[PDB]
Every structure is written in C-alpha cells, then in structure tokens.
Amino acid sequence: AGSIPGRRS
Amino acid sequence: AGSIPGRRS
Amino acid sequence: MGSMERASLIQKAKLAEQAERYEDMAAFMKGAVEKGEELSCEERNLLSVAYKNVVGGQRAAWRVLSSIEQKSNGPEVREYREKVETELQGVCDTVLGLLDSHLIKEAGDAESRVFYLKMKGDYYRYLAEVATGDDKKRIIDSARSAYQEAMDISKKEMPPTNPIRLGLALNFSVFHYEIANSPEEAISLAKTTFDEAMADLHTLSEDSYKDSTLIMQLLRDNLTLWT
Amino acid sequence: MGSMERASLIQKAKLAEQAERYEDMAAFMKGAVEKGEELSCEERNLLSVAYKNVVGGQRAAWRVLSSIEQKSNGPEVREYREKVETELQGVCDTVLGLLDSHLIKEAGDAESRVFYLKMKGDYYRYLAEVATGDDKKRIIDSARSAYQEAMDISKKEMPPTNPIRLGLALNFSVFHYEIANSPEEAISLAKTTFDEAMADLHTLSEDSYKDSTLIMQLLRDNLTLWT
Ligand SMILES: *Cc1ccc(S(=O)(=O)N2CCC[C@@H](OC)C2)cc1
Ligand SMILES: *Cc1ccc(S(=O)(=O)N2CCC[C@@H](OC)C2)cc1
C-alpha cells in the first residue's frame, strides 16, 4: 500500500 | 569518465 | 539556526532539496519554523518534503533491520535496529513538536490546518509502525484523532478534488489498512474518495485535473492491491 | 566507538550496508580501524565502500551547488556550497588520517599496501576536485605520488588482471584526465592496462574472468568517451 510519496517539492 | 563505482561490498 | 535569516533558511532548504541533502533541508526548515511566523503554502511543502525524505530513509532502514532480526529469531542486530528506531522516533518527535509549538494552533485557514493535521497523523503513524503493546495503542489513537480532525475540516471546507484532501484520505486509508487492522474501512475510504473526486473533475482546469488525477491513481493502485 | 568490540563493529558495518546507512557504516569501520589491528581483505572493502558512498554523495551535492553558483555569477549559494565543501574535506581528511595512522605503515603485503595507497590517491583526488590555486598543486601532487607508488608495487607484485591493479589503473587514468589535465596520459594508461589484462585472461577461472572483465569494460567505457 502506498502513501503519498511526498518526497519531491 | 567513470572511476571504480566502489559503492557495493 | 537562530542566527540565520528566515529568508536565507528558506533559500538554503530549496538548494538542499536540489542537492538531495534532505537532513540539511529539514534542519533549515526547522530553523525557519522556529522563527515563529506562519508558513506559506510553498514553505509548508518544503517542511513536509524534507522530513518525509528523512524519515522515509529511516523507515526503510528499520524495515531491513527488523527483517534480519526476525529471521535470526549475538545482540548486534537488535542493538542496531534499536539505534535506528530511536533516531526515527526522535525525528518524529521533532516534527510533532514543531506542529505543537506552534504551527497547528496558529493555522486558521483550512488549507494550512488540514495540511498540519495530516502531518501530525503521518508522524504518529510512523511512530506506530515501530511501537509495541500499549504504547502502540495510545500512539495509534493519536494518529487517528489527528487524521479524523483533518478529515472533518477537509470535507466541510475543501472540494473533493483538492490535492491535500485527496492525499489526506489516501494516507488515512493506509493508516486503516496497515496500522489499525481495518482493511474494510481502508477500502471504503479509498473508494468513496475516488468516486467523489471523479464526479468533481469536470470543474477543474487542465493543470488542476492533472494534480487531482495523479493522486486518484494512487488511490486506485491501493484498491487494486487490496481487492 | 571505543567501547564496542571490534567484531561487533564489523558486524554492524555489514548491517549498515544492507540498510543503506553509509554514514553509520563509515563510523563503524572507523571504529574498527581504530582498534589498531590490521584489516582483512573483506574488512578493507567494507571501509572503502563506506567512505566511497559517503564522499560520493557529498561530491554529487557539491557539483549541484557549484553549478548553481557558477550560473549565478545573495551569499546563500556560496555559503551552502562552502558548508558542503568543508564537510567533504573533513571526511577526506578523516580517511587520510586512518591511512596515515596507521594502516599504510603496517601494510606489508602487496594486496593491502596497494589497496591503501589507491585509497590515499582517491581521497587526495577528491580534495583536488574542490581545491583552488596553489593548494590545488600540492594536493594534486599528493594524489599523484600515492597512485604512483601503488602502481609501482602493483606492476611488480600483481598480475595484470588483478582487480585491485585494474581499479587502481582505472582511477589513476581518471586522475590524469580530470585532475592533472593529461588526457593523453589517461588514454595511454587505460589502453595499456586493458591490453595487458586481455593477454592474461587465459590464466583465469570463470569467476576471476568475470571480476577482471567487469573492470576492463569500465576502462573501455572511458576510452570510448575520451577518443
Ligand atoms: C500530503 C500531500 C498531498 C498532496 C501532495 S501534491 O499533490 O503532490 N501537492 C504538493 C504541492 C501543493 C499541491 O499542489 C497542487 C499539492 C503532497 C502532499
Ligand atoms: C578499487 C577497487 C578495485 C576493484 C574493486 S572490485 O573488483 O569490485 N573488488 C572488491 C572485492 C574484492 C575484489 O574482488 C575480487 C575486488 C573494488 C575497488
């Protein structure tokens, strides 16, 4: 299950 | 130009 | 970072992102929060990107170590998993402390308050991933409470395609599936969120459509894995 | 890491590699070197892998920042490039200090002495990448001297297919091309090294053949880019 990757502005 | 990557044991 | 100007910390956080120096990026954005002013939308995203990358690397390392430890069941694997776990917990506590002192209480607009409450749910969720026993129970409830407050505001104040509303619902569905042992609640939330966004896409510009459909696809990807 | 057993530091360095925690891996291997015993072949490789990954990330960040700084030509980009540069220099100085106190002087077998002298050339080369002016000259000469001593031993004591001999020649050729402004010396060294290895492949087992041909391909890849 993926959460928001959220790692790139 | 590549040197030895050398980053994995 | 008390002696550096706020604007310089923001500037350096953007450079640190370009350089893939996420620990530096998080330290610059912590310094910027501690100046005491509220954060703009772009600044909130820099704070979140920095910490998500730092804690994401810690979580990936903790999972590798926990897997080795479980297979082995000397003290070294457990000791080193504990080291990484304590570091991860410290980063989560730092982020939660910024949110508590004083980002949430000063956030009045829905966009900012929902963003920070989603972060609060996420970092308690990361604490819950490594927690055991009764500590786990109270940490789980703290994640759930933060996500629920964010959901209640988002449903009253934002359209169903808003990217923060969508990403909140995605991450709360992951919380239900992976942490709370509630797969049916996870599937129901992801399906309802996806369907209500689909029905509002007609209102969007081309660029907003792209932003919303990208997150919808992540909801769909989870539903495919869970069903 | 003075209170941790040598064997535990080695064990934890291997776990840190699996977890992609290279800063931890380098700190464990520094602790292991500082126990004062000589390093086995496997331990030398753990030391080198750890530091090559740490300094490799620093170099990549320094290049991003130096590029932004050159394009811009406030103080922030230069200040942050300087920060990263100082950190990189400190890591290189730490590795060079381990080699000087006392890994090289205790290394009597060709395999260990060549390995450490190649490391010494590499870390002076990384210092040279960020150095300017006359500092650059003495740093360049220190890299050249270390690589040359390693080359002289390798040519007397190792076969032309030995992987350390090959990787030394590859990295010394990169030094000539990228640092010393000697592209013709770089091309000549890579060609001679490749040809003399080719002529010795017939002596190798299947597994040694694979090890040597992998490095030969890197020599070929550089020759293709340089010619
Ligand atoms: C938690 C979360 C939700 C959504 C995103 S995003 O869609 O990648 N994004 C960040 C920039 C601002 C907004 O863009 C319209 C939303 C990121 C994190
Ligand atoms: C500097 C350098 C040269 C060669 C290598 S390798 O071939 O990847 N390797 C490391 C394990 C021991 C040897 O394997 C036969 C050589 C690495 C670094």
Short mmCIF file of C-alpha atoms and ligand atoms in Angstrom, two decimals:
data_model
loop_
_atom_site.label_atom_id
_atom_site.label_comp_id
_atom_site.label_asym_id
_atom_site.label_seq_id
_atom_site.Cartn_x
_atom_site.Cartn_y
_atom_site.Cartn_z
CA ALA A 1 0.00 0.00 0.00
CA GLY A 2 1.40 3.37 -1.00
CA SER A 3 1.03 6.58 0.94
CA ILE A 4 1.67 9.97 -0.72
CA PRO A 5 5.34 9.63 -1.77
CA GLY A 6 5.66 13.26 -0.81
CA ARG A 7 9.41 13.36 -1.29
CA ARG A 8 9.73 15.96 -4.13
CA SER A 9 8.74 19.63 -3.75
CA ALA B 1 34.76 9.47 -17.12
CA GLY B 2 33.94 6.80 -14.57
CA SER B 3 36.11 5.77 -11.66
CA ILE B 4 35.51 2.45 -9.85
CA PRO B 5 31.93 2.89 -8.57
CA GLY B 6 33.11 1.08 -5.48
CA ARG B 7 29.89 1.63 -3.59
CA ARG B 8 28.70 -2.01 -3.06
CA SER B 9 30.61 -4.57 -0.95
CA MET C 1 19.76 28.15 13.14
CA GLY C 2 18.91 31.16 15.25
CA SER C 3 21.48 33.46 13.67
CA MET C 4 20.41 32.84 10.06
CA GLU C 5 17.72 34.98 8.43
CA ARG C 6 14.38 33.29 7.74
CA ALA C 7 14.62 34.02 4.03
CA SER C 8 18.14 32.53 3.89
CA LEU C 9 16.94 29.35 5.62
CA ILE C 10 14.14 29.02 3.05
CA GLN C 11 16.60 29.66 0.21
CA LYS C 12 19.03 27.04 1.56
CA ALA C 13 16.23 24.49 2.05
CA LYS C 14 15.47 24.80 -1.67
CA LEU C 15 19.16 24.36 -2.53
CA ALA C 16 19.41 21.37 -0.19
CA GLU C 17 16.47 19.74 -2.00
CA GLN C 18 18.22 20.23 -5.36
CA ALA C 19 21.39 18.73 -3.86
CA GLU C 20 19.40 15.82 -2.34
CA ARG C 21 20.67 16.82 1.11
CA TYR C 22 17.46 16.12 2.98
CA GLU C 23 18.87 16.18 6.50
CA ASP C 24 20.18 19.69 5.80
CA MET C 25 16.84 20.59 4.22
CA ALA C 26 14.98 19.50 7.32
CA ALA C 27 17.33 21.42 9.61
CA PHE C 28 16.88 24.60 7.52
CA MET C 29 13.11 24.25 7.59
CA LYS C 30 13.11 23.56 11.36
CA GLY C 31 15.07 26.78 11.75
CA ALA C 32 12.54 28.58 9.57
CA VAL C 33 9.57 27.30 11.62
CA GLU C 34 11.31 28.34 14.82
CA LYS C 35 11.39 31.95 13.64
CA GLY C 36 7.77 31.93 14.80
CA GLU C 37 5.99 33.19 11.71
CA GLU C 38 3.34 31.17 9.92
CA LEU C 39 4.44 29.26 6.75
CA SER C 40 3.21 29.88 3.23
CA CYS C 41 1.94 27.03 1.09
CA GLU C 42 5.30 26.59 -0.60
CA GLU C 43 7.12 26.71 2.75
CA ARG C 44 4.79 24.07 4.24
CA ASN C 45 5.62 21.82 1.31
CA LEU C 46 9.35 22.32 1.85
CA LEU C 47 8.97 21.35 5.52
CA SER C 48 6.95 18.26 4.63
CA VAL C 49 9.23 17.14 1.78
CA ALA C 50 12.31 17.47 3.97
CA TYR C 51 11.01 15.39 6.85
CA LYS C 52 9.25 12.84 4.66
CA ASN C 53 12.58 12.09 2.95
CA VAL C 54 14.50 11.90 6.24
CA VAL C 55 12.01 9.66 7.98
CA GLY C 56 11.43 7.68 4.78
CA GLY C 57 15.08 6.64 4.72
CA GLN C 58 14.95 5.76 8.41
CA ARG C 59 11.82 3.66 7.93
CA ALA C 60 13.35 1.79 5.02
CA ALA C 61 16.44 1.04 7.11
CA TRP C 62 14.34 -0.01 10.12
CA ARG C 63 12.41 -2.43 7.91
CA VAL C 64 15.61 -4.01 6.58
CA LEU C 65 16.98 -4.42 10.09
CA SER C 66 13.67 -5.66 11.56
CA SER C 67 13.50 -8.29 8.82
CA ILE C 68 17.05 -9.51 9.58
CA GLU C 69 16.26 -9.54 13.29
CA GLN C 70 13.06 -11.56 12.79
CA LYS C 71 14.92 -14.12 10.67
CA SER C 72 17.61 -14.52 13.35
CA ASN C 73 14.87 -15.25 15.92
CA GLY C 74 24.55 -12.00 19.31
CA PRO C 75 22.94 -8.72 20.38
CA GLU C 76 24.17 -6.69 17.35
CA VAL C 77 21.17 -6.81 15.01
CA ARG C 78 18.75 -5.89 17.79
CA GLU C 79 21.10 -3.21 19.12
CA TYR C 80 21.45 -1.61 15.69
CA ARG C 81 17.72 -1.87 14.91
CA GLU C 82 17.16 -0.15 18.27
CA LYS C 83 19.62 2.59 17.37
CA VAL C 84 17.85 3.31 14.08
CA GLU C 85 14.48 3.08 15.82
CA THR C 86 15.47 5.66 18.42
CA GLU C 87 16.74 8.02 15.75
CA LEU C 88 13.48 7.63 13.78
CA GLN C 89 11.46 8.28 16.93
CA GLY C 90 13.50 11.40 17.60
CA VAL C 91 12.80 12.80 14.13
CA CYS C 92 9.09 12.08 14.51
CA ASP C 93 9.07 13.77 17.91
CA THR C 94 10.85 16.80 16.43
CA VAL C 95 8.24 17.21 13.69
CA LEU C 96 5.39 16.66 16.15
CA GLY C 97 6.96 19.28 18.41
CA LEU C 98 7.06 21.84 15.60
CA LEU C 99 3.42 21.16 14.87
CA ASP C 100 2.53 21.55 18.55
CA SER C 101 4.79 24.61 19.09
CA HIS C 102 3.12 26.35 17.37
CA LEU C 103 2.15 25.59 13.78
CA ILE C 104 -1.27 23.99 14.35
CA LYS C 105 -2.59 26.48 16.85
CA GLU C 106 -1.77 29.40 14.57
CA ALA C 107 -3.26 27.72 11.45
CA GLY C 108 -6.75 29.11 10.83
CA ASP C 109 -7.25 28.64 7.18
CA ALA C 110 -8.46 25.22 6.18
CA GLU C 111 -5.57 24.65 3.78
CA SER C 112 -2.96 25.17 6.45
CA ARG C 113 -4.79 23.46 9.32
CA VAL C 114 -5.62 20.35 7.28
CA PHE C 115 -2.02 20.18 5.99
CA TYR C 116 -0.58 20.26 9.51
CA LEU C 117 -3.09 17.81 10.95
CA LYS C 118 -2.33 15.38 8.12
CA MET C 119 1.38 15.72 9.02
CA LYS C 120 0.52 15.07 12.66
CA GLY C 121 -1.35 11.88 11.67
CA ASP C 122 1.53 10.77 9.44
CA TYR C 123 4.23 11.18 12.09
CA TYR C 124 2.19 9.41 14.76
CA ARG C 125 1.62 6.69 12.14
CA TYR C 126 5.39 6.34 11.69
CA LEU C 127 5.75 6.13 15.50
CA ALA C 128 3.03 3.42 15.48
CA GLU C 129 4.92 1.36 12.87
CA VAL C 130 7.75 0.78 15.40
CA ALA C 131 5.71 0.75 18.59
CA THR C 132 4.67 -2.31 20.55
CA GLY C 133 1.93 -3.18 23.03
CA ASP C 134 0.03 -0.50 24.94
CA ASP C 135 2.31 2.33 23.84
CA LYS C 136 1.16 1.29 20.40
CA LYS C 137 -2.48 1.81 21.42
CA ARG C 138 -2.16 5.40 22.54
CA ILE C 139 0.08 6.29 19.58
CA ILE C 140 -2.45 4.74 17.19
CA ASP C 141 -5.22 6.76 18.75
CA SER C 142 -3.21 9.96 18.43
CA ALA C 143 -2.73 9.28 14.69
CA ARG C 144 -6.41 8.50 14.26
CA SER C 145 -7.52 11.62 16.10
CA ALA C 146 -5.30 13.92 14.01
CA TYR C 147 -6.41 12.34 10.73
CA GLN C 148 -10.07 12.48 11.79
CA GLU C 149 -9.94 16.17 12.64
CA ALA C 150 -8.23 16.86 9.30
CA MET C 151 -10.89 14.81 7.50
CA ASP C 152 -13.75 16.64 9.21
CA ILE C 153 -12.33 20.05 8.21
CA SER C 154 -11.48 18.90 4.67
CA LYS C 155 -14.97 17.62 3.99
CA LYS C 156 -16.53 20.91 5.15
CA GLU C 157 -14.03 23.35 3.59
CA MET C 158 -12.43 21.80 0.51
CA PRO C 159 -13.73 20.34 -2.76
CA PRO C 160 -13.39 16.60 -3.16
CA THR C 161 -10.62 17.05 -5.76
CA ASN C 162 -8.41 19.25 -3.60
CA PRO C 163 -4.95 17.57 -3.59
CA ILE C 164 -4.44 17.94 0.18
CA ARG C 165 -7.90 16.47 0.82
CA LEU C 166 -7.05 13.61 -1.52
CA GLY C 167 -3.64 12.93 -0.02
CA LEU C 168 -5.10 13.06 3.49
CA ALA C 169 -7.69 10.45 2.52
CA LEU C 170 -5.05 8.30 0.85
CA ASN C 171 -2.81 8.36 3.93
CA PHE C 172 -5.72 7.80 6.34
CA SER C 173 -6.73 4.79 4.26
CA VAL C 174 -3.17 3.45 4.59
CA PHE C 175 -3.41 4.02 8.34
CA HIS C 176 -6.63 1.95 8.44
CA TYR C 177 -5.15 -0.85 6.35
CA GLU C 178 -1.63 -1.08 7.77
CA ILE C 179 -1.88 0.20 11.36
CA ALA C 180 -5.47 -0.09 12.62
CA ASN C 181 -6.18 -3.55 11.18
CA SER C 182 -9.28 -2.12 9.44
CA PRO C 183 -8.89 -3.14 5.77
CA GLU C 184 -12.60 -2.73 5.05
CA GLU C 185 -12.53 0.87 6.37
CA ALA C 186 -9.43 1.48 4.21
CA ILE C 187 -11.14 0.15 1.08
CA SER C 188 -14.36 2.07 1.77
CA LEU C 189 -12.50 5.34 2.33
CA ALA C 190 -10.37 4.96 -0.78
CA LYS C 191 -13.39 4.05 -2.96
CA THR C 192 -15.59 6.87 -1.70
CA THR C 193 -12.75 9.37 -2.04
CA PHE C 194 -12.00 8.25 -5.58
CA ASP C 195 -15.64 8.34 -6.67
CA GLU C 196 -16.40 11.72 -5.17
CA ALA C 197 -13.27 13.17 -6.84
CA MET C 198 -14.19 11.69 -10.20
CA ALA C 199 -17.55 13.42 -10.06
CA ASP C 200 -15.89 16.81 -9.43
CA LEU C 201 -13.16 16.62 -12.13
CA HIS C 202 -15.41 18.49 -14.61
CA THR C 203 -14.90 21.68 -12.56
CA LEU C 204 -11.11 21.71 -12.93
CA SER C 205 -8.60 23.36 -15.25
CA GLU C 206 -6.15 21.19 -17.17
CA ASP C 207 -3.41 21.71 -14.58
CA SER C 208 -5.67 21.05 -11.57
CA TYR C 209 -7.05 17.99 -13.36
CA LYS C 210 -3.52 16.65 -13.64
CA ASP C 211 -2.82 17.27 -9.93
CA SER C 212 -6.03 15.55 -8.79
CA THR C 213 -5.92 12.60 -11.18
CA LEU C 214 -2.35 11.82 -10.12
CA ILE C 215 -3.48 11.22 -6.53
CA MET C 216 -6.62 9.42 -7.66
CA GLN C 217 -4.38 6.93 -9.43
CA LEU C 218 -2.59 6.25 -6.14
CA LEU C 219 -5.99 5.54 -4.50
CA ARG C 220 -6.76 3.19 -7.40
CA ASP C 221 -3.38 1.48 -7.08
CA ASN C 222 -4.10 0.71 -3.44
CA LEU C 223 -7.60 -0.51 -4.19
CA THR C 224 -6.13 -2.88 -6.81
CA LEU C 225 -3.66 -4.24 -4.24
CA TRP C 226 -6.33 -4.58 -1.51
CA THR C 227 -9.14 -6.12 -3.58
CA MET D 1 33.29 3.59 19.20
CA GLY D 2 35.89 2.70 21.79
CA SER D 3 33.54 0.67 23.97
CA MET D 4 32.24 -1.60 21.19
CA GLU D 5 34.01 -4.85 20.34
CA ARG D 6 35.87 -4.97 17.02
CA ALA D 7 33.81 -7.91 15.81
CA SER D 8 30.57 -6.09 16.68
CA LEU D 9 31.68 -3.01 14.73
CA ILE D 10 32.41 -5.20 11.70
CA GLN D 11 29.04 -6.95 12.09
CA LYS D 12 27.21 -3.60 12.34
CA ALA D 13 29.06 -2.20 9.32
CA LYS D 14 27.69 -5.10 7.27
CA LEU D 15 24.17 -4.46 8.59
CA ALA D 16 24.53 -0.73 7.87
CA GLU D 17 25.46 -1.54 4.26
CA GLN D 18 22.34 -3.71 3.90
CA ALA D 19 20.27 -0.87 5.38
CA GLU D 20 21.97 1.69 3.07
CA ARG D 21 23.11 3.62 6.15
CA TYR D 22 26.52 4.58 4.83
CA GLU D 23 27.36 7.25 7.38
CA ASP D 24 26.80 4.66 10.12
CA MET D 25 28.81 2.13 8.10
CA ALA D 26 31.74 4.52 7.87
CA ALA D 27 31.60 5.31 11.59
CA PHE D 28 31.60 1.56 12.45
CA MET D 29 34.55 0.92 10.16
CA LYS D 30 36.46 3.94 11.56
CA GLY D 31 35.91 2.44 15.00
CA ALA D 32 37.17 -0.91 13.74
CA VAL D 33 40.35 0.62 12.24
CA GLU D 34 40.99 2.48 15.48
CA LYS D 35 41.18 -0.81 17.37
CA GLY D 36 44.69 -0.92 15.93
CA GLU D 37 44.71 -4.32 14.28
CA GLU D 38 45.33 -4.77 10.57
CA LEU D 39 42.23 -5.29 8.33
CA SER D 40 41.42 -8.39 6.33
CA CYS D 41 40.54 -8.16 2.66
CA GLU D 42 36.82 -8.16 3.39
CA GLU D 43 37.26 -5.54 6.13
CA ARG D 44 39.27 -3.27 3.79
CA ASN D 45 36.44 -3.47 1.30
CA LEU D 46 33.90 -2.53 3.96
CA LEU D 47 35.98 0.52 4.91
CA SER D 48 36.33 1.58 1.28
CA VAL D 49 32.67 1.01 0.37
CA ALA D 50 31.50 3.02 3.38
CA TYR D 51 33.61 6.08 2.69
CA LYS D 52 33.17 5.95 -1.08
CA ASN D 53 29.39 6.15 -0.59
CA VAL D 54 29.63 8.97 1.96
CA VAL D 55 32.02 11.09 -0.06
CA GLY D 56 30.21 10.17 -3.29
CA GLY D 57 27.02 11.77 -2.00
CA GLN D 58 28.94 14.82 -0.84
CA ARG D 59 30.65 15.19 -4.22
CA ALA D 60 27.35 14.92 -6.07
CA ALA D 61 25.86 17.61 -3.83
CA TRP D 62 28.93 19.84 -4.22
CA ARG D 63 28.66 19.57 -8.00
CA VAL D 64 24.97 20.57 -7.95
CA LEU D 65 25.72 23.56 -5.74
CA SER D 66 28.86 24.59 -7.68
CA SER D 67 26.83 24.54 -10.89
CA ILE D 68 24.12 26.78 -9.37
CA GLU D 69 26.79 29.10 -8.00
CA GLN D 70 28.56 29.38 -11.37
CA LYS D 71 25.27 30.19 -13.11
CA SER D 72 24.51 32.95 -10.57
CA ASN D 73 27.94 34.50 -11.31
CA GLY D 74 22.90 36.92 -2.11
CA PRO D 75 25.59 34.96 -0.26
CA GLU D 76 23.44 31.81 0.29
CA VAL D 77 24.52 29.58 -2.61
CA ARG D 78 28.20 30.20 -1.95
CA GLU D 79 27.73 29.81 1.81
CA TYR D 80 25.96 26.48 1.38
CA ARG D 81 28.43 25.20 -1.24
CA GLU D 82 31.16 26.12 1.26
CA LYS D 83 29.38 24.22 4.02
CA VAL D 84 29.16 21.06 1.90
CA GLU D 85 32.74 21.55 0.75
CA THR D 86 34.03 21.76 4.31
CA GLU D 87 32.13 18.63 5.28
CA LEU D 88 33.54 16.77 2.25
CA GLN D 89 37.05 17.92 3.12
CA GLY D 90 36.57 16.70 6.67
CA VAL D 91 35.56 13.23 5.52
CA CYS D 92 38.55 13.06 3.17
CA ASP D 93 40.86 14.16 5.98
CA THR D 94 39.38 11.50 8.27
CA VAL D 95 40.04 8.72 5.75
CA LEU D 96 43.54 10.04 5.02
CA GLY D 97 44.19 10.13 8.76
CA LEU D 98 43.19 6.48 9.15
CA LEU D 99 45.51 5.56 6.32
CA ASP D 100 48.35 7.54 7.92
CA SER D 101 47.61 6.33 11.49
CA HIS D 102 48.43 3.55 10.88
CA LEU D 103 47.02 1.42 8.07
CA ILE D 104 49.66 2.07 5.38
CA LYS D 105 52.71 1.69 7.56
CA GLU D 106 51.53 -1.68 8.85
CA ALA D 107 50.57 -2.97 5.36
CA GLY D 108 53.36 -5.23 4.06
CA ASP D 109 51.62 -7.47 1.67
CA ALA D 110 51.17 -6.06 -1.79
CA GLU D 111 47.41 -6.56 -1.76
CA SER D 112 46.94 -4.48 1.35
CA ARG D 113 49.55 -1.81 0.60
CA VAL D 114 48.32 -1.23 -2.95
CA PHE D 115 44.69 -1.08 -1.72
CA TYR D 116 45.51 1.59 0.87
CA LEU D 117 47.70 3.65 -1.46
CA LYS D 118 44.93 3.63 -4.07
CA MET D 119 42.55 4.92 -1.34
CA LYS D 120 45.09 7.61 -0.46
CA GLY D 121 45.24 8.69 -4.12
CA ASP D 122 41.44 8.69 -4.38
CA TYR D 123 40.85 10.86 -1.31
CA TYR D 124 43.51 13.37 -2.31
CA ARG D 125 41.84 13.37 -5.74
CA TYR D 126 38.51 14.25 -4.12
CA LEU D 127 40.27 17.04 -2.18
CA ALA D 128 41.75 18.25 -5.51
CA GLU D 129 38.29 18.39 -7.14
CA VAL D 130 37.29 21.21 -4.72
CA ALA D 131 40.67 22.86 -4.30
CA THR D 132 41.82 26.06 -5.96
CA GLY D 133 45.15 27.66 -6.83
CA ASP D 134 48.39 26.59 -5.14
CA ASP D 135 46.66 24.44 -2.52
CA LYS D 136 45.43 22.57 -5.55
CA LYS D 137 49.01 21.99 -6.71
CA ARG D 138 50.27 20.32 -3.57
CA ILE D 139 47.08 18.27 -3.19
CA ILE D 140 47.39 17.11 -6.81
CA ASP D 141 50.95 16.06 -6.21
CA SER D 142 49.97 14.12 -3.11
CA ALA D 143 47.36 12.19 -5.14
CA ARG D 144 49.85 11.53 -7.91
CA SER D 145 52.53 10.32 -5.52
CA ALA D 146 50.17 7.87 -3.78
CA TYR D 147 48.86 6.49 -7.07
CA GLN D 148 52.39 6.19 -8.48
CA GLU D 149 53.67 4.22 -5.50
CA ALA D 150 50.64 1.91 -5.75
CA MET D 151 51.26 1.48 -9.48
CA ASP D 152 54.93 0.64 -8.98
CA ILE D 153 54.09 -2.06 -6.40
CA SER D 154 51.17 -3.42 -8.45
CA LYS D 155 53.26 -3.86 -11.58
CA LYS D 156 55.96 -5.76 -9.65
CA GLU D 157 53.72 -7.88 -7.40
CA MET D 158 50.36 -8.48 -9.07
CA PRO D 159 49.22 -9.98 -12.39
CA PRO D 160 47.80 -7.56 -14.92
CA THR D 161 44.27 -8.93 -14.36
CA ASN D 162 44.25 -8.46 -10.60
CA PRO D 163 41.09 -6.42 -9.81
CA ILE D 164 42.86 -4.03 -7.42
CA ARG D 165 45.60 -3.43 -10.01
CA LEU D 166 42.92 -2.80 -12.61
CA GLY D 167 40.87 -0.46 -10.45
CA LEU D 168 44.00 1.44 -9.44
CA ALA D 169 44.87 1.97 -13.10
CA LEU D 170 41.32 3.00 -13.91
CA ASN D 171 41.25 5.58 -11.12
CA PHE D 172 44.76 6.87 -11.91
CA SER D 173 43.67 7.32 -15.52
CA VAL D 174 40.68 9.37 -14.29
CA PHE D 175 43.08 11.43 -12.19
CA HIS D 176 45.18 12.13 -15.31
CA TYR D 177 42.15 13.05 -17.41
CA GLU D 178 40.09 15.04 -14.91
CA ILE D 179 42.58 16.50 -12.42
CA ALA D 180 46.06 16.65 -13.98
CA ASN D 181 44.97 17.93 -17.41
CA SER D 182 46.83 14.99 -19.01
CA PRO D 183 44.25 13.33 -21.29
CA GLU D 184 46.90 11.64 -23.42
CA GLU D 185 48.47 10.04 -20.31
CA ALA D 186 44.96 8.93 -19.25
CA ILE D 187 44.27 7.32 -22.64
CA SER D 188 47.68 5.65 -22.79
CA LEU D 189 47.32 4.21 -19.28
CA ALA D 190 43.82 2.91 -19.90
CA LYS D 191 44.79 1.33 -23.25
CA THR D 192 47.95 -0.34 -21.95
CA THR D 193 46.12 -1.60 -18.87
CA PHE D 194 43.29 -3.01 -20.95
CA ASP D 195 45.61 -4.72 -23.44
CA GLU D 196 47.87 -6.26 -20.85
CA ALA D 197 44.82 -7.60 -18.97
CA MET D 198 43.33 -9.06 -22.13
CA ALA D 199 46.51 -11.01 -22.75
CA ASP D 200 46.37 -12.54 -19.24
CA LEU D 201 42.67 -13.55 -19.20
CA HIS D 202 43.55 -17.08 -20.40
CA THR D 203 45.08 -17.80 -16.97
CA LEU D 204 41.87 -17.13 -15.04
CA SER D 205 38.99 -19.21 -13.69
CA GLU D 206 35.44 -18.38 -14.74
CA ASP D 207 34.82 -16.32 -11.60
CA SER D 208 38.12 -14.40 -11.81
CA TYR D 209 37.47 -13.80 -15.51
CA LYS D 210 34.17 -12.18 -14.60
CA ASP D 211 35.82 -9.95 -11.97
CA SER D 212 38.57 -8.78 -14.33
CA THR D 213 36.43 -8.31 -17.43
CA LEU D 214 33.99 -6.15 -15.46
CA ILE D 215 36.72 -3.61 -14.72
CA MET D 216 38.14 -3.89 -18.22
CA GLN D 217 34.76 -2.78 -19.53
CA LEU D 218 34.99 0.34 -17.38
CA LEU D 219 38.42 1.09 -18.92
CA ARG D 220 36.85 0.59 -22.36
CA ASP D 221 33.91 2.84 -21.48
CA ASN D 222 36.30 5.65 -20.60
CA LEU D 223 38.37 5.12 -23.73
CA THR D 224 35.17 5.38 -25.80
CA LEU D 225 34.28 8.67 -24.09
CA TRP D 226 37.83 10.08 -24.44
CA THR D 227 38.54 9.06 -28.04
C1 LIG E 1 0.01 15.18 1.64
C2 LIG E 1 0.13 15.63 0.19
C3 LIG E 1 -0.96 15.71 -0.67
C4 LIG E 1 -0.75 16.14 -1.96
C5 LIG E 1 0.52 16.48 -2.35
S1 LIG E 1 0.85 17.08 -4.02
O1 LIG E 1 -0.37 16.86 -4.80
O2 LIG E 1 1.98 16.35 -4.59
N1 LIG E 1 0.93 18.73 -3.70
C6 LIG E 1 2.14 19.48 -3.16
C7 LIG E 1 2.20 20.86 -3.80
C8 LIG E 1 0.99 21.61 -3.48
C9 LIG E 1 -0.21 20.98 -4.01
O3 LIG E 1 -0.17 21.01 -5.42
C10 LIG E 1 -1.35 21.46 -6.05
C11 LIG E 1 -0.35 19.53 -3.51
C12 LIG E 1 1.59 16.44 -1.48
C13 LIG E 1 1.39 16.02 -0.19
C1 LIG E 2 39.43 -0.01 -6.10
C2 LIG E 2 38.66 -1.27 -6.45
C3 LIG E 2 39.06 -2.17 -7.42
C4 LIG E 2 38.29 -3.29 -7.65
C5 LIG E 2 37.15 -3.47 -6.91
S1 LIG E 2 36.11 -4.93 -7.15
O1 LIG E 2 36.60 -5.61 -8.36
O2 LIG E 2 34.72 -4.52 -7.30
N1 LIG E 2 36.63 -5.85 -5.84
C6 LIG E 2 36.16 -5.71 -4.41
C7 LIG E 2 36.11 -7.09 -3.75
C8 LIG E 2 37.43 -7.69 -3.76
C9 LIG E 2 37.93 -7.90 -5.11
O3 LIG E 2 37.13 -8.86 -5.77
C10 LIG E 2 37.83 -9.89 -6.42
C11 LIG E 2 37.96 -6.60 -5.92
C12 LIG E 2 36.77 -2.59 -5.92
C13 LIG E 2 37.53 -1.49 -5.68
#
